[PDB]
Amino acid sequence: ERGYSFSLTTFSPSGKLVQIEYALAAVAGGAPSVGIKAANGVVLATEKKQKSILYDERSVHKVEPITKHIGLVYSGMGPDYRVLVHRARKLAQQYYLVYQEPIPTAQLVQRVASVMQEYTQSGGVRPFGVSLLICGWNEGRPYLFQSDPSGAYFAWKATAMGKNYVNGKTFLEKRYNEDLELEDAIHTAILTLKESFEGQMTEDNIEVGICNEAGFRRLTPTEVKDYLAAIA
Template identity: 35%
Template sequence: MTSIGTGYDLSNSVFSPDGRNFQVEYAAKAVENGGTAVGIRCRDGVVLAVEKLVQSKLLVPGSNKRIGTVDRHMGIACAGLIPDARHFISRARTEASSWRKNYHTPIPVSSLSDRMGLYAQAYTLYSSVRPFGVTSIIGGMDEEHGPTLWMVEPSGVGWGYYGAATGRGRQAAKAELEKLDLPNISVEEGVKHAARVILIAHGDNSNKDKDFELEMTWVRAADPAAAAGQTEGPVKAMGKHEPVPKELVEEAERQAREDVKGDEEDEKMEG
C-alpha cells in the first residue's frame, strides 16, 4: 500500500485501505517538530524537563511555559503545538477538579491519564475536529503507588513509564534514559540526569545551533522513605508540583555541559 494519503487524509474519521489514520500520523509529526520533553520517575518523586527553543532574542526568558500544574501533586510536560498543549492542560485541570469534587481525594495519575487518553481519542473520531498535535508526559505522586509517570500520545494511547521522552530529540533522549537505574535514583539526581538528557537530545537534532531554555519541575515526596516503599501504608504527604529551584537547574545544566564536552573530547581522542 502507498505511504501517502491519496485522499484518505482529508478526514480523521476515515481509514486508508491498509488501516491507517493519516490525520493521527500527521499529529505525531507535529509533535516531532517541537522541543524535547522528558519525564523521569525516581524513588522519591518525579522530574519533568522540557527543551524550549529560543526563536527570538526579543523573547522574555521564562515565558511561554511548556509545563503546567494540574493539581497540587501533579504536573504535565508537553511537546508539540503549544496552543493544543494549553487546552489539554486546561482540560486535565477540569478532570482533576471534578474528581476532587466527586470523591474528595486527589486524582491518581493513572486515572487522569485514562481520562485524558479518552479525551484525546475522541478528537480522532469526527471529521469536524482534528487530533491534538501534542504528546503529554503526566507525572506526580499517588497516595497508594507513590511516584507515577504516564505519557499520552495524540492517538489517545497512554502508557506508564519509568522514563519517558517525546519531541524532536526523543530517540537520543530514550537512549540516554535506558542507561539509568531509574527506580533507584533520587529526585536531586534526576534533575542532573534530566539536564544531561535534554542537552544530548538538543545536540542530536537539526536545531542544535539554536539557543534553548531548560524548563524543569519536580514533585518530591515529603516522606522519601514512604515513597521508596521503605515504610508500610500509603504515602500520606504526597509533595507539591513546583519549579526546580533556579540555582539547582543552572548547576545541573553547567555540569551537563561539562560532562557532554568531556565525552566529546574522549571520543575525538579515541578516534
Template identity: 40%
Template structure:
C-alpha cells in the same frame, strides 16, 4: 499496499486500506517539530525536563512555558503545538477539579490519565475535528507512589519509568535506557534530565533554548513545582560539564 495520495489522509475518521489513520500520524509529526521533553520516574519522585526552543532573541525570557501544574500533586510537560498543549492542560485541570469536588479527595493519577486519554481519543473519531498536535507527559505522586504517564496523539497512554517526546526523542530514549533509573535519587534524576536535554539539543538548527525543570517528590512535599534555583543551577553545571567532557573525548578521537 500504499495509501499515500489516495485521499485517505483527508479525514481523521477514515481508515486507509492498510488500517492507518494518517491524520493521527501527521499530528505526531507536529510534535516532532518542537523541542524535546523527557520524564524520569524514580523511587521517590518524578522529574520533567523540557528543551524550550526560543525562536527570537526578542522573546521575553521565561515566557511561553511548556511545564504546567494541573493539581498540587500533578503536573504536565509537553512537546507539540502550543495551543493544543494549553487546551489539554485546561481540560486536565477541569477533570481534576471536578473529581475532587465530587469525591472530596485528590484525583488519582490513573483516573486522570484515563480521562485525558479518552478525551484525546475522542478527537480521532469525527471528521469535523482533528487530533491534538501534542503528546503530554504527566507526573504525579499519589497513594500508589510516583507515577509517570505519556499520552500519544491517538489517545493511547502508558506508564513509564522514563519517556521522551519531541524532535530528539529517539536519542533521548537511548540516553534514558543507559540509566539505572531504579537506583537514582530524585536529585540525580534532575541532573541526568538536564544532561540529556543538553546532549540532544542541536546547536546548528536551534541556537537558542531554555531548559525547564520541574519535580514532584518527597523532597518537594509531594507538591508539583519548579525545581529550586540552587538545584537547577547545579544540574545545569553538571550537564554542561558532562557535554564538555564528551566533546573533549570526540576531539581526542
C-alpha cells in the same frame, strides 16, 4: 449555525488511519523533552528557546500544575496545549467536588485520554497535535504516564520525546536503573538533554519540574543555575 457532521478520519485500503500518522509526524518535530523517576520522586525536563533577545523568557511557562501534586509537560504544537490544560483542570474540579478527595493520577490520565480519543471520531474536526507527559505522587509510589494523539497511553520508568527521541531512549537504556535519588536523576536528565542542546546552555533555556511526597513545584532559575554549574 451548523457544522459538517461527517468524520474526516477514515480507514485506508491497507487498514490504517492516515490522519493519526500525520499528527504523529507533526509531533516528532517539536521541542525535545525527558522524564525520569527513581524511587523518591519524578523529574521532568524540557528545553525552551526564544528566537531573539526581544522575547521575554519569564512571561510564559512550559511546565504547568494541574493541582497540588500533578504535573504535565508537552511536545508538539503550541496552541493546542492550553485547551488540554484547561480541560484537565476542569475535570479535576468535578472529581474533587464529587468525592471530596484529590484525584488519583490514573483516573486523570484515563479521562484526558478519553477526551483526546473522542476528538478523532466526531465530525468536521481534526485531531490534536501534541504528546503529553504526566507525573504525580499518590500513596507513596510515584507515577509517570505518557499520552498519544490516538488516545492510547503507557506507563514508563524513563522516557524521551520530541526531536531525536530514539537517541534519548538508547542513552537512557545504558544509564537508568531502579535505585537513585532526585539529585542524580536531575543530573542525568540535564546530561541527556545536552545531547541535542545548543552550544551554550544557560539557566533560562531549560525548565525543570520535581515531584516528591511534598508536592509539585517548578524550580526557580537560581537553583537551575546551581544545578547547571558543577556538572558537565
